[PDB]
Design a protein around this ligand. Structure first.
Ligand SMILES: Cc1cc2nc3c(=O)[nH]c(=O)nc-3n(C[C@H](O)[C@H](O)[C@H](O)COP(=O)(O)OP(=O)(O)OC[C@H]3O[C@@H](n4cnc5c(N)ncnc54)[C@H](O)[C@@H]3O)c2cc1C
Ligand SMILES: CC(C)=CCC/C(C)=C/CC/C(C)=C/Cc1c(C)[nH]c2ccccc2c1=O
Ligand SMILES: Cc1cc2nc3c(=O)[nH]c(=O)nc-3n(C[C@H](O)[C@H](O)[C@H](O)CO)c2cc1C
Ligand code: FES
Ligand code: FES
Ligand SMILES: [Ca+2]
Lengths: 412, 446, 251, 408, 204, 198
């Protein structure tokens, strides 16, 4: 009987009623469960079946395998690094000192080395769910506030924005920093320009750039990527830089990092970016449907392969990042996350089919450039996408100015 | 030939059987005043006056000389006026058998007629309104002239009639009309058709061209884009095959030929077929007994571009050659935007419907969503074959920039040219109105 | 009476402006030079352990205690000259009095080294307390300059100061943290074999070690700069022969 | 003192070198020669001005008078000249006053044009027939409470050739005026003493020009009759200065002299052979009297006419005998007036309220075709915008609606 | 009157409405010391330039007006630079190249051309003072926010205790970087045109 | 061969004058509505910088350097007046000569010369050249590269502001506020070349 309830109180929220101030919150909750039931007004009497809700929910559902594997891997790396350092009665005092650990043990899990896949996903969930809840609440506040004050209806997109921002952050991020980051991403990069479809940047990447340059020590270094108290370890793009492929070693276990480990995702890093296989599984589904752009993906791959092979060819004896081939650039860091789900943003990208190729090529080239010849930062995906977001309109300008010359010759 | 590869053939139920069957006798016709763009009438008759066939009903203030005449004899019964006292229809009740007659000619004299004689006979008979000029899709002036005149000998609209089935009953009138149109132009006449053969003319400048592909292709816009690109300094005239038959019959017998052959089709029509009818006939009498019990929408023209015919608009338009009928979709469903739709049509591949090929859909008038902002996922590029940038042009139309739209190619377009972009938009924009606003601003500024 | 007027106006205005400007510029040169010298004097007095506030005390104590000297790097003994106004930063640029380091010698990535350097002797009465050496090296974002006070025995460090650097305000710009700088008091530069033995340890250094200083937390790339500049300037291409000779005596 | 002398000498020499270099460059690089302006075809007689200057100022230099309102700058926007060859550009006032109105032939606002290159213009003869005059006031008296009939006598017996609806511009010099010198009769002294209006005073210290609309049809010779409304401070802020021109005209009396510019033109009647409907109000009785009289007397046309004047009392109504002197023998002319709130001393037996409610209800509501008529209106800002709203809700085209804003 | 000296603060702001002088406002607002010193310097130079150009407004040749005005302005800023290096050497080094860029600061030449060439000497002085005050308003506000948030201290005085030195506040990194000045000035313009809707620009 | 390549790439990308150094922001923010006008102004800036920086390097090294003209005399307090005079004179003579001899090029670019006749961009260019003590060829390359980088930044801002015709900005932020926020986001974008030591 949910349908009839939402119909009786609809008069309360339309103009002239006592509750006219909360119309945007009623419409967003009414149209979630049921379809509006509207008919066409003019001169196109049949419409397609697709809308923005499905376009957004198909991208929201595509990162679920990556999210689940990220939780599993976070818990597993934490448990392994914990058992590496402590044993006996000093591991119990470590477990009793952290709520992430004693809640995991209370709900049924275990912090010992022989923990199954269930005890690891539980710890990863204890790390991931507070961040996602904080991000969702704080960003939805600003979203609804703007749509209320400006007297509009709530556009779609923040589901994807929030889930992406919550999966591209380290597992040990403080909650107030996540709140400030989602505030800067939603308000300064999206909502100040008019909402969905009207900005020119990526809001999730704008919020993560806010956190990287403002508080650079909770999103960098060796103490943020394995949620283990007292453990210090380096990731593989910051171990290749200091010694090459011979330096890729897992200190918590003493095992070499093979290429399959990075492809499958048994490596430390940002919550969801680790599993290239799961990212491919989702990206194939959303590329088949026609939502993500295979032109942008192909351009990113072309740029990465070309610049990688050029660096491999010219060579260098002091910089160990010249040796890294194209198939290693693909599985390390967040290149697949940004190539598949964050570069394919329709609003931030180019609008022309011949400009999308240049957009993707610029993204890939800038990523490999910041990876290799910038000593300060171990990757460059959030900065190469942010850099290409500014020149995306310029490629469209070039293309459309070439198009206008064909029309004046009377051939187009 | 020219092959269109980007388009969309709409899968919809109720396609007609291409056999010309007789129709109901109509008791009242009308002239819809709101389909002529930029038209401000000067009424020549009042309620209660009796009229004759081809007798002037009103005139145009913005276009001097252009006459609008009566499709049938009878007597004026009502004049419908709406918001801000705008003219909606002039309804005549069929009666009597009085008409106005003109000069008659022979078939060999027609190619050597004088252009001003042709013009005067057309304007006097009121057949000048069958023409439309690109840009702005208006009725041509009385003193103007064109180098390119396009004959629409095809139709790729959904649920539309095949032109050849009708032309093969009026071959000789079609040829006479093509000859008159060869004498009326200073350039050439382009007969845009499909592969099948049509009655042909032995004149030099009359020439046939062939188009193949889905439907953007049966439109005069693509024909002009691919044969005579238009601009402010080049203007082309457009006409369809039934009006060419009307021209030929006028010049061959001296009387006006106000018959039609429309297709009565739709997902709710019991027996879809081709129906003989009169110009501007009453749709509420034409669809009587040929629909299913329920709440339906009657349309004059396509579902892609037409006129919802209710009340004072329930009459066949001037440039429309079919009637479409389909149900009104007002149902609400739990999480309908998220369900897997086997019976849901889309240009994208999100639903399970595209996996079943050859499926026909019982579409309704539902907007499958709410009005939102434009997020470009690449749907406009899939359904537009012209050499334009659709996303940038449509954003210029949305924003209200006329100068940029003209550079991006608005002067080539019509409302029928963006009906499919309106169809496949996830933000539920209607681009015909935006382009009409842009063209109004352009035509006013200059 | 038109171009004449223009030229007369511009000449008069230029005369007035030039008189005022050239009077202001030449009159203040000495005060500008003292303002330039006082900051370096204060930093040297700070690293030397002497406390002084105000231009009065700064100039008095610097003139009474600190005695600059010129040292030739290759030979390692004092060379005569006016050390109070020597400019090593600019002497390193001119190829007349500089050298180009080999890629194997250039551990600190400075690419150029002057022939003679200036050191400051801290004097207590008529005896020498300690020696202050200027060293510099390249970090992740900038060239970091420092002052280090070596005792008379040639090993023991009594202080450290980084008076110029542009590293990130709370990651590697912690070379100016007093709690970090106080870890250098007592550390020994050279071992028993007289090797360079200062180590900036990643991840904490054992308490009681004589050669170990803690690294910067989350800045292994500004900690590498410190380690490299120290193992260079403590080498044979820097202050190594001078430190060996002062260890033998002669101070 | 070794460096101060060097500094002074070097500063002086460097600045002198730069100045001399710039002068030597400009001496050879900037043209300066003969520049002509040939207008309306080419009888080689032209305006030969030096390359430095402005266009409309160069035109006005030699007996050519274009319509200017604020001394120049681009407020009004009626200095439209044809530029067949000259400066090709559009300047900020062109976008605001000749907004888009695409001019392929080339008609730019003369104010913004540059005379540096050579100019080639096309100027219609109606600009060449304007002249200045020195007229004397025949009479100056109230016809309403705040309306005065300024009548001038053109000397020499020569009379101004103009058309009904044109407007002269009035020239007044620096002066001082005070309100207690006005000729307000006893019939109209009531409201003045009630707001204490006689306390105001003004003085202007520069020349000024404002445009005024003749109230006599052209066949009346040797006369220019004008109806002026004095512009006192608005009641919300009575501190600000009053109107300086409208107050000047009220000061003039029989035996003075006034100076006027030649016939300017806009807002002319058409010959479509349609019905004419006139709606006047306020000091807008001037263009309506010229329009209604030009038709019945000179043109002798039989178009169906009408006049609807909206006053505030019977005291506010003037020219009532002249109009009835027209409608009585010319049966195709009818006129009505409508008082808003007549004082009880009036005892009015006609219509009340505003004119758009009296014009619609009595006449246009039951009209066969309201869109076929032509509407000429001239009144205050409140009346103008209220009627044009009503006419549009009747389907009338802005090509049938002729409006005469008073520029305010 | 006080109108001319207090209108540029909110009614007609140089940076907020008449855009002029953004280059130094984006650069020196990291420290409230440098902001105060630059405000004083701009006041002094703009006022003196207005005074002298208004004095010599009659005899300036119109062919080389810019050379004369730049001579006056550059002499003034040169003596200012000499005075700064002798008495405030700490701040003079922090002002890397923006002490000499008061020449090409736009407020100076804007007030010199638009107002000093047409007015008496005394009113031009008050005009220059008012423009310096309006400039310093934005300078000091942006500097307050950036210095308090990015480093936890005001005028070099510890107000918020830093975690590194044993406190509770962790300072923000962007406030000491390039983009933060843009956001602070944009939000200040938002707040200004919120209380004074006279300055809101047209629909398009 | 390669010492001037690194200088050009550095001046264009690693140290952008518009976004990293904040030089010339009034024209950068005011004249960035259309890509055409932005392109014209950028070309004018490139030309003026490329002509102005070498001339001032030459004048400095010849007369104004310490001990350049006579031993013991330092006339380096005249830097500001000399540089601003050279810049103004060159810009004025440029607009004159192009107006008289090439009316096409004059209507193309000389319309954008009256703006940059006294600009913080060019004054800061010559000031940084003085600070860094370049050679003649290094001055030419530095000026050209910095002008090209300024042009790139302004053309990108103009492209963004042309794309933003579909935006819906609050009324208090229409114009200046949203342009300042856009420039800040562009600076976050160009912060990619931070740690590059070129
Ligand atoms: C073609 C044409 C024909 C015209 N015909 C006529 C005609 O027949 N009769 C007629 O009367 N006018 C006519 N006008 C209008 C004419 O141009 C003047 O507007 C009119 O004569 C009064 O001018 P003014 O000098 O009083 O205006 P102003 O003196 O400029 O202003 C008068 C009013 O403005 C107010 N005011 C002044 N300064 C301010 C301020 N700072 N803030 C607010 N309010 C202020 C005064 O209090 C006063 O109410 C015509 C105009 C045109 C274009
Ligand atoms: C959800 C709810 C009950 C109320 C909204 C209140 C709230 C705190 C949400 C903030 C997040 C937000 C604004 C999302 C927009 C959005 C909606 C509402 N429905 C969506 C539905 C489908 C797909 C995407 C979206 C989407 O993207
Ligand atoms: C393929 C696709 C990719 C998307 N990627 C992002 C993203 O990376 N960051 C984000 O905040 N929103 C993303 N969105 C959501 C939406 O595009 C975003 O809110 C717009 O960029 C805002 O106008 C994506 C949406 C789709 C359909
Ligand atoms: S006065 Fe306004 S245009 Fe000349
Ligand atoms: S201050 Fe921005 S241009 Fe001079
Ligand atoms: Ca050095």
């Amino acid at each position: 009987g949910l349908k009839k309830f939402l119909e009786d109180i609809e008069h309360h929220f339309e103009p002239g009623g006592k509750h006219e101030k909360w119309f945007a919150l009623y419409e967003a909750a009414a149209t979630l469960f049921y379809t509006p039931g509207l008919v066409t007004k003019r001169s196109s009497h049949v419409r397609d079946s697709v809308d923005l809700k499905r376009i957004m929910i198909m991208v929201w559902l595509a990162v679920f395998p990556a999210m689940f594997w990220g939780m599993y891997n976070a818990g597993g790396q934490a448990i392994a690094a914990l058992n590496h350092l402590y044993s006996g009665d000093q591991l119990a005092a470590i477990v009793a000192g952290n709520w992430h650990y004693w809640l995991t043990e209370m709900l049924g899990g275990t912090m010992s080395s022989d923990a199954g896949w269930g005890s690891k996903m539980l710890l990863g969930a204890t790390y991931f769910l507070p961040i996602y809840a904080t991000v969702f609440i704080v960003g939805g506040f600003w979203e609804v506030l703007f749509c209320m004050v400006r007297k509009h209806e709530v556009n779609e997109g923040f589901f994807v924005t929030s889930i992406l921002f919550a999966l591209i952050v380290p597992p040990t991020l403080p909650l107030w920093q996540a709140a400030l980051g989602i505030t800067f991403g939603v308000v300064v990069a999206k909502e100040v320009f008019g909402g969905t479809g009207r900005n020119f940047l990526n809001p999730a990447l704008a919020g993560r750039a806010f956190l990287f340059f403002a508080y650079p020590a909770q999103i960098s270094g060796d103490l943020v990527w394995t949620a283990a108290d007292g453990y210090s370890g380096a990731t593989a793009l910051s171990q290749w830089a200091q010694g090459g492929a011979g330096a890729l070693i897992n200190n918590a276990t003493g095992q070499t990092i093979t290429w399959m480990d990075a492809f499958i995702g048994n490596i430390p890093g940002s919550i969801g970016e680790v599993s290239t296989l799961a990212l491919m599984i989702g990206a194939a589904f959303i590329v088949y449907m026609g939502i993500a752009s295979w032109r942008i993906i192909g351009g990113v791959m072309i740029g990465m392969i070309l610049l990688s092979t050029l660096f491999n060819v010219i060579g260098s004896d002091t910089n160990a990042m010249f040796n890294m081939p194209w198939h290693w650039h693909l599985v390390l860091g967040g290149f697949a996350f940004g190539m598949f789900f964050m570069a394919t943003d329709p609003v931030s990208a180019s609008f022309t089919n011949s400009g999308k190729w240049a957009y993707g090529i610029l993204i890939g080239v800038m990523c490999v450039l910041i990876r290799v010849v910038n000593p300060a930062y171990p990757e460059g995906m959030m900065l190469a996408i942010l850099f290409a977001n500014l020149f995306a309109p310029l490629f469209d300008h070039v293309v459309v100015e070439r198009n206008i010359k064909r029309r004046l010759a009377r051939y187009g | 030939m020219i092959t269109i590869k980007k388009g969309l053939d709409l899968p919809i139920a109720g396609t007609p059987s291409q056999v010309i069957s007789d129709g109901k006798a109509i008791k009242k016709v009308a002239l819809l005043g709101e389909e002529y763009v930029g038209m401000r009438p000067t009424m020549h008759v009042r309620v209660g006056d009796e009229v004759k066939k081809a007798q002037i009903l009103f005139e145009d203030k913005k276009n001097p000389g252009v006459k609008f005449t009566s499709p049938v004899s009878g007597k004026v019964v009502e004049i419908n006026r709406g918001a801000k006292r705008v003219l909606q229809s002039v309804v005549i009740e069929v009666a009597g058998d009085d008409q106005v007659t003109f000069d008659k000619f022979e078939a060999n004299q027609l190619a050597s007629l004088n252009r001003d004689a042709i013009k005067t006979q057309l304007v006097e008979s009121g057949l000048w309104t069958a023409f439309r000029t690109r840009p702005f899709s208006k009725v041509p002036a009385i003193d103007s002239t064109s180098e390119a005149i396009f004959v629409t000998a095809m139709d790729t609209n959904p649920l539309a009639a095949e032109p050849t089935v009708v032309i093969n009953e009026q071959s000789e009138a079609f040829v006479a009309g093509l000859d008159v149109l060869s004498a009326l132009t200073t350039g050439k006449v382009y007969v845009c058709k499909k592969g099948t053969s049509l009655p042909r003319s032995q004149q030099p400048n009359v020439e046939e061209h062939v188009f193949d592909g889905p439907h953007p292709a049966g439109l005069a816009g693509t024909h002009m884009h691919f044969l005579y690109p238009v601009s402010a300094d080049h203007v082309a005239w457009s006409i369809n095959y039934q009006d060419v038959i009307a021209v030929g019959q006028l010049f061959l017998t001296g009387e006006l030929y106000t018959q039609r052959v429309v297709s009565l089709a739709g997902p709710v029509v019991n027996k879809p077929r081709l129906v003989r009818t009169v110009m501007g006939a009453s749709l509420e009498q034409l669809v009587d007994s040929e629909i299913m019990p329920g709440e339906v929408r009657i349309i004059s023209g396509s579902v892609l571009s037409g006129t919802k015919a209710t009340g004072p608009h329930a009459y066949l338009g001037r440039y429309h050659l079919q009637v479409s009928v389909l149900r009104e979709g007002r149902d609400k469903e739990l999480f309908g935007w998220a369900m897997p739709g086997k019976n849901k049509f889309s240009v994208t591949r999100s639903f399970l419907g595209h996996l079943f090929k050859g499926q026909v859909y019982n579409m309704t008038t539902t907007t499958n969503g709410s009005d939102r902002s434009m997020v470009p996922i690449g749907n406009y590029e899939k359904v537009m074959p012209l050499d334009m940038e659709p996303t940038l042009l449509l954003r210029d139309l949305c924003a209200g920039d006329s100068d940029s739209a003209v550079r991006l190619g608005a002067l080539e377009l019509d409302e029928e040219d963006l009906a499919l972009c309106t169809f496949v938009c996830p933000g539920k924009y209607e681009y015909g109105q935006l382009l009409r606003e842009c063209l109004d601003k352009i035509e006013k500024e200059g | 009476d038109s171009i004449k007027k223009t030229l007369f106006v511009v000449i008069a205005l230029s005369l007035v402006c030039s008189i005022i400007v050239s009077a202001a510029a030449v009159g203040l040169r000495d005060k500008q030079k003292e303002n330039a010298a006082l900051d370096k004097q204060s930093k040297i007095l700070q690293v030397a352990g002497i406390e002084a506030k105000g231009s009065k005390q700064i100039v008095e104590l610097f003139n009474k205690s600190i005695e600059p000297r010129l040292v030739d790097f290759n030979t390692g003994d004092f060379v005569e000259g006016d050390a109070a106004n020597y400019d090593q930063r600019k002497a390193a640029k001119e190829a007349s009095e500089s050298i180009k380091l080999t890629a194997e010698q250039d551990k600190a990535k400075i690419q150029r080294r002057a022939n003679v350097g200036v050191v400051y002797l801290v004097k207590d009465g008529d005896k020498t307390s300690k020696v202050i050496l200027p060293v510099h090296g390249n970090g992740l974002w900038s060239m970091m300059y420092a002052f280090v006070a070596v005792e008379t025995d040639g090993n023991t460090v009594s202080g450290l100061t980084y008076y110029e650097q542009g590293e990130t305000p709370g990651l590697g710009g912690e070379v100016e943290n007093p709690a970090w700088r106080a870890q250098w008091v007592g550390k020994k530069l050279f071992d028993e074999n007289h090797k360079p033995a200062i180590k900036i340890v990643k991840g904490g250094a054992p308490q009681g070690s004589e050669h170990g200083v803690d690294g910067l937390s989350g800045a292994t790339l500004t900690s590498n700069g410190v380690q490299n500049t120290f193992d260079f300037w403590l080498g044979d291409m820097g202050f190594g022969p001078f430190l060996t000779k002062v260890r033998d005596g002669g101070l | 003192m070794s460096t101060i002398i060097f500094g002074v000498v070097m500063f002086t020499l460097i600045i002198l070198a730069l100045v001399l270099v710039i002068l030597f460059a400009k001496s050879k690089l900037v043209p300066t020669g003969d520049i002509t302006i040939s207008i309306n075809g080419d009888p080689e007689k032209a305006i030969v001005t030096q390359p430095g200057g402005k266009l409309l100022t160069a035109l006005a230099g030699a007996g050519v008078f274009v319509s200017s309102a604020c001394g120049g700058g681009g407020s009004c926007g009626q200095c439209r000249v044809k530029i067949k060859s000259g400066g090709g550009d559009i300047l900020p006032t062109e976008l605001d006053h000749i907004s888009k109105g695409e001019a392929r032939e080339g008609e730019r606002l003369a104010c913004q044009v540059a005379v540096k290159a050579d100019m080639d213009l096309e100027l219609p003869e109606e600009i060449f027939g304007v002249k200045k005059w020195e007229c004397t006031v025949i009479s100056n008296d109230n016809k309403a409470t705040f309306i005065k009939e300024l009548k001038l006598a053109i000397p020499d017996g020569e009379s101004v050739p103009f058309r009904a609806g044109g407007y002269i511009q009035i020239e007044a010099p620096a002066h001082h005026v005070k309100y207690a010198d006005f000729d307000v009769p006893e019939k109209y002294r009531g409201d003045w003493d009630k707001f204490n209006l006689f306390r105001y005073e003004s003085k202007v210290d520069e020349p000024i020009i404002r445009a005024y609309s003749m109230a006599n049809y052209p066949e009346e010779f040797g006369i220019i009759m004008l109806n002026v409304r004095i512009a006192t401070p608005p009641p919300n802020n009575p501190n600000v200065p009053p109107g300086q021109m409208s107050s000047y005209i009220w000061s003039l009396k029989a035996g003075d002299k006034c100076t006027i510019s030649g016939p300017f033109g806009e807002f002319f009647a058409k010959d479509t052979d349609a019905e004419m409907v006139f709606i006047g109000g306020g000091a807008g009785m001037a263009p309506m009297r010229s329009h209604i009289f030009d038709q019945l007397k000179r043109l002798k046309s039989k178009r169906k006419m009408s006049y609807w004047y909206g006053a505030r009392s019977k005291r506010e109504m003037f020219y009532v005998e002249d109009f009835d002197g027209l409608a009585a023998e010319n049966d195709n002319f009818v006129w009505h007036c409508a008082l808003s709130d007549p004082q009880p001393e009036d005892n009015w037996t006609g219509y009340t309220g505003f004119i758009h409610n009296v014009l619609y209800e009595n006449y246009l509501k039951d009209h066969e075709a309201p869109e076929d008529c032509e509407y000429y209106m001239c009144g205050p800002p409140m009346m103008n915008a209220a009627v044009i709203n009503m006419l549009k809700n009747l389907g009338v085209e802005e090509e049938n609606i002729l409006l005469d804003d008073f520029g305010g | 009157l006080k109108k001319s000296v207090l209108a540029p603060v909110l009614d007609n702001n140089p940076i907020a409405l008449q855009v002029l002088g953004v280059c130094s406002a984006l650069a020196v607002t990291t420290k409230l010391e440098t902001a105060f010193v630059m405000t004083l310097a701009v006041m002094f130079v703009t006022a003196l330039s207005n005074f002298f150009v208004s004095l010599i407004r009659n005899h300036i040749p119109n062919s080389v007006r810019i050379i004369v005005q730049m001579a006056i302005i550059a002499s003034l800023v040169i003596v200012v630079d000499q005075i700064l290096k002798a008495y405030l050497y700490d701040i003079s080094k922090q002002l890397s190249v923006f002490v000499g860029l008061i020449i090409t600061n736009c407020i100076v030449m804007g007030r010199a051309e638009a107002f000093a060439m047409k007015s008496e000497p005394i009113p031009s002085f008050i005009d220059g003072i008012g423009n310096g005050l309006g400039y310093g308003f934005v300078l000091m506000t942006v500097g307050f926010f950036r210095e308090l948030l990015g480093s936890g201290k005001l005028f070099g005085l510890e107000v918020l205790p830093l975690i590194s030195n044993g406190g509770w506040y962790q300072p923000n990194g962007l406030m000491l970087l390039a983009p933060s000045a843009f956001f602070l000035i944009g939000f200040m313009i938002w707040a200004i045109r919120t209380f004074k809707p006279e300055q809101v620009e047209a629909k398009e | 061969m390669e010492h001037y390549i690194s200088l050009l790439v550095k001046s264009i990308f690693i140290e952008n004058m518009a976004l990293s150094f904040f030089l010339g922001m009034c024209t950068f923010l005011a004249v960035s509505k259309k890509v055409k006008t932005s392109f014209g102004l950028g070309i004018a800036v490139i030309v003026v910088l490329t002509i102005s920086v070498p001339v001032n390097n030459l004048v400095y090294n010849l007369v104004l350097k310490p001990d350049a003209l006579v031993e013991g005399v330092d006339l380096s307090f005249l830097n500001f007046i000399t540089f601003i005079g050279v810049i103004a004179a060159l810009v004025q003579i440029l607009e004159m000569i192009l107006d008289r001899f090439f009316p096409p090029l004059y209507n193309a670019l000389g319309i954008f010369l009256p703006l940059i006749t006294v600009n913080c961009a060019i004054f800061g260019g010559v000031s940084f050249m003085v600070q860094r003590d370049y050679s003649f060829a290094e001055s030419v390359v530095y000026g050209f590269g910095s002008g090209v980088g300024w042009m790139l930044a302004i053309v990108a801002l103009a492209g963004i502001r042309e794309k933003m015709k579909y935006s819906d900005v609050p009324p208090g932020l229409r114009g200046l506020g949203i342009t300042f926020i856009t420039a800040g986001l562009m600076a976050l974008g160009f912060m990619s070349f931070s740690g590059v030591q070129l």
